[PDB]
């Protein structure tokens, strides 16, 4: 049944709660972003109002065939009224179209649901700075101090320099980038840009990217694989078997693959610097795992919460075990005592 942490008290609202059937007493279903653990259950047969960003509403219509009359897209950074309650959508710094939601309850409580986010200091100068937040529904994916990772910028720098070196040394090398959802587009687009190529992909993935309002997108992507030296493939195919296979398909146009797997965190983060990342190589195939995260590091999350000073925190990730729950609650108390709220 619908967990409490998907329900917004004092409203008839739910957040990312599409897999429970009809939630009893829910008059509006918010969707923070287009990732499957969050949209699970939406289809053309859904007949309740869904509130979301423009981008997320393009994906609902075009990819899941939700009928237009049930999609209620909202502009960002704008006070809007939904079933008599003031709300604001803010950028979540996650994937394209991902939002955080501010709810201004009739009784005077203010609630921020982060959806999935990567906390950033730029958030300290949105509409959040203007008033106090009593309850925080927090993306806790990496709420433990072992989770450090580089900035997105340092990671993209590493990838651009690696790819550019490899292809200038060998103009017959192919670059492959793995994907399984939206998000992380900068990886493959930045690499294609430095190489003077478009990114070649399947028709289903090209359709997905055309929903996202990226500027100049017709200039960076294509479904003609033959004319491209940066190919996007399902993350499942980013392994030695899958890449040998794919290489055979290119018909002797290429004699080497350099592949990128942008993971979340992986334990080499505890030791290794970005400068010091190396591939796994077999034959004429190399695979780089790069730590491109679209969730907060532990330290980014701590800063955000210590700035915001909420009165109550409700975790939305890693809530299924007692040892996780208990550990998270201990960090929340540490942060509150160190900062004095
Ligand atoms: Ni997500």
């Amino acid at each position: 049944t619908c967990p409490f942490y998907k329900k917004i008290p004092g409203t008839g609202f739910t957040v990312d709660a599409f897999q429970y059937g009809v939630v009893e007493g829910c008059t509006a279903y918010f969707l923070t972003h287009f990732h499957s653990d969050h949209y699970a259950g939406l289809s053309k047969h859904f007949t309740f109002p869904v509130y979301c960003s423009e981008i997320t509403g393009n994906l609902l219509k075009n990819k899941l065939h939700v009928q237009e009359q049930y999609i209620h897209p909202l502009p960002l950074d704008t006070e809007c009224i939904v079933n008599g309650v003031k709300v604001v959508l803010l950028d979540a710094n996650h994937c394209p179209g991902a939002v955080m939601i501010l709810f201004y309850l009739p009784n005077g409580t203010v609630i921020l649901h982060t959806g999935d986010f990567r906390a950033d200091p730029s958030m300290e100068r949105s509409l959040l700075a203007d008033q106090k937040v009593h309850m925080l529904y927090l993306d806790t994916t990496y709420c433990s101090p072992e989770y450090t990772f580089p900035s997105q910028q340092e990671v993209i720098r590493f990838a651009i320099n690696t790819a550019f070196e490899a292809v200038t040394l060998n103009p017959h090398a192919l670059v492959v980038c793995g994907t399984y959802s939206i998000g992380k587009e900068k990886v493959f687009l930045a690499i294609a840009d430095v190489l003077g190529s478009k990114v070649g992909m399947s028709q289903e993935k090209y359709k997905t990217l055309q929903c996202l309002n990226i500027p100049e997108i017709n200039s960076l992507i294509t479904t003609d694989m033959c004319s491209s030296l940066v190919h996007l493939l399902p993350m499942m195919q980013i392994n030695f078997k899958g890449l040998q296979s794919h290489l055979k398909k290119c018909g002797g146009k290429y004699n080497q693959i350099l592949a990128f797997r942008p993971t979340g965190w992986t334990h080499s983060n505890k030791f290794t610097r970005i400068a010091d990342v190396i591939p796994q190589t077999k034959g004429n195939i190399s695979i780089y795992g790069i730590p491109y995260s679209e969730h907060s590091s532990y330290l980014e999350m701590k800063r955000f919460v210590q700035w915001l000073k909420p009165q109550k925190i409700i975790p939305t990730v890693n809530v299924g075990t007692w040892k996780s729950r208990s550990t998270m609650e201990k960090y929340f108390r540490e942060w509150k005592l160190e900062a004095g709220y």
Side-chain angles (χ1 to χ4, degrees), residues 1-23 25-203 205-215 217-240 242-247 249-269 271-281 283-311 313-341:
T1 59
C2 184
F4 72 101
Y5 63 82
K6 293 187 187 278
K7 293 173 165 202
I8 301 305
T11 65
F13 300 158
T14 59
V15 178
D16 296 353
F18 296 92
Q19 67 168 297
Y20 304 95
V22 176
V23 170
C26 181
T27 67
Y29 292 82
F30 284 78
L31 181 58
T32 64
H33 68 291
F34 198 74
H35 277 164
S36 53
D37 283 358
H38 300 257
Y39 65 72
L42 276 166
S43 68
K44 74 177 76 174
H45 310 290
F46 204 78
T47 51
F48 297 104
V50 179
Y51 287 83
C52 60
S53 63
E54 179 185 352
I55 283 157
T56 299
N58 297 345
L59 291 150
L60 296 184
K61 182 195 171 174
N62 288 296
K63 295 291 295 184
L64 302 179
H65 303 297
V66 170
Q67 298 170 36
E68 196 135 63
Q69 82 178 103
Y70 305 112
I71 307 173
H72 296 261
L74 307 171
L76 303 189
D77 304 312
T78 297
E79 302 183 312
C80 305
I81 306 317
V82 171
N83 299 355
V85 172
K86 181 160 72 174
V87 302
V88 173
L89 306 190
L90 303 159
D91 205 285
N93 190 35
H94 185 53
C95 62
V99 300
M100 313 196 285
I101 317 162
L102 258 187
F103 304 88
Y104 295 82
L105 262 54
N107 76 7
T109 307
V110 177
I111 297 178
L112 172 61
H113 197 302
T114 66
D116 282 354
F117 86 144
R118 186 167 180 176
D120 193 74
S122 67
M123 297 169 176
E124 298 156 30
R125 300 167 272 289
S126 63
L127 301 197
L128 282 176
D130 303 41
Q131 86 297 274
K132 156 179 203 71
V133 168
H134 303 84
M135 313 183 78
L136 182 56
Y137 285 71
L138 179 66
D139 167 19
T140 45
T141 296
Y142 302 123
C143 191
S144 198
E146 68 269 35
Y147 295 110
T148 52
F149 27 66
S151 69
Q152 287 175 171
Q153 192 270 334
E154 297 171 69
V155 174
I156 290 298
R157 182 92 301 220
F158 174 81
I160 280 170
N161 290 357
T162 298
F164 180 77
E165 180 182 322
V167 176
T168 297
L169 295 170
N170 181 193
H172 299 281
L174 174 67
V175 177
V176 181
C177 288
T179 184
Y180 38 37
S181 41
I182 68 170
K184 310 185 192 195
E185 289 81 9
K186 193 77 173 162
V187 175
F188 52 89
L189 300 178
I191 290 171
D193 184 66
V194 84
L195 296 174
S197 183
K198 293 195 191 181
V199 178
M201 61 194 70
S202 72
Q203 291 179 247
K205 186 70 182 191
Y206 182 94
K207 174 182 176 165
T208 300
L209 302 188
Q210 286 295 159
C211 300
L212 304 186
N213 297 354
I214 286 173
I217 199 60
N218 298 332
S219 79
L220 315 140
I221 60 168
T222 179
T223 58
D224 178 7
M225 309 280 301
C226 290
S227 74
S228 157
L229 58 149
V230 185
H231 296 175
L232 288 207
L233 294 184
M235 199 71 84
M236 286 193 67
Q237 197 172 358
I238 314 310
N239 53 76
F240 301 109
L243 295 165
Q244 279 156 213
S245 191
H246 177 77
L247 188 54
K249 285 162 247 173
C250 297
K253 201 161 204 300
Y254 312 105
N255 62 353
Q256 180 183 12
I257 285 181
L258 184 127
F260 291 90
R261 286 180 351 83
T263 60
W265 167 90
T266 60
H267 193 61
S268 8
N269 268 306
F271 313 113
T272 333
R273 272 162 152 69
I274 191 64
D276 315 342
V277 167
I278 66 171
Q280 271 206 265
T281 296
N284 60 340
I285 302 183
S286 290
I287 303 170
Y288 285 85
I290 58 168
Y292 194 94
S293 171
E294 280 186 348
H295 301 275
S296 309
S297 80
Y298 173 85
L299 288 170
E300 294 163 347
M301 185 183 305
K302 177 175 186 279
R303 180 191 167 118
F304 179 81
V305 173
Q306 279 183 317
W307 173 77
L308 192 85
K309 307 176 172 73
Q311 299 185 358
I313 309 175
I314 302 176
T316 65
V317 187
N318 301 311
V319 299
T321 84
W322 298 116
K323 179 169 175 225
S324 293
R325 280 194 163 288
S326 175
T327 299
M328 292 184 297
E329 292 184 12
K330 289 177 34 262
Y331 295 126
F332 302 152
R333 189 55 50 173
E334 288 179 26
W335 302 348
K336 186 182 151 80
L337 290 173
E338 176 191 33
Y341 49 103

